[PDB]
């Protein structure tokens with residue numbers, strides 16, 4: 001689980017609500033993005049782990065499915 005809106009989550013879960021695999025935050029493939037550890041160095045944007053850099057309502061990630069840009073992660077609110 002994550003606390004509040006999930007901004008402080010730093011666990012190692014990396015799978016979405018539909019069972020897709022999170023793209024790595026430093027990767028531009030399949031989805032080109034601007035939410036990189038480059039730009040957000042203090043948000044825990046390590047590997048492909050579920051995170052919340054933009055103050056969303058839960059941890060999320062861009063997905064490895066080329067047709068689905070981003071999803072919330074299959075974690076529950078503590």
Ligand SMILES: NC[C@H]1CC[C@H](C(=O)NS(=O)(=O)c2ccccc2)CC1
Nearest residue numbers: 032033034035054055056060069070
């Ligand atoms: N938690 C919700 C999602 C909303 C889409 C968002 C995105 O795609 N942002 S971005 O790569 O900086 C970006 C922003 C504007 C134009 C191109 C790319 C990722 C986070």
